[PDB]
Point group: C3
Chain length 38, copies 3
């Protein structure tokens, strides 16, 4: 990547995808609670 | 320096969040292990 | 050098993210397995 603008664009894409992984992780953690809870 | 400092700041905040999430993954793995074992 | 250091740091973030994606996928697969069998 040659420009600041491009590095920032790529970083934003990572951030957006990560936002989604965090949400999915939260949902998985809930499913672990349910299994523990029985 | 303004653009470089802002990109660095943002990258550092991402890196920190990723270190946090890895700690949470470690804890969740422990809980999965307990469900698999017991 | 800066653009180079920034690129390096971005590449490390990207790599870490790919690791995270893989860990999460492995975690989810184990939960799935526990849920069914």
């Amino acid at each position: 990547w040659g420009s600041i603008d491009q590095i920032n664009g790529k970083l934003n894409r990572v951030i957006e995808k990560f936002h989604q992984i965090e949400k999915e992780f939260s949902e998985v953690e809930g499913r672990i609670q349910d299994l523990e809870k029985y």
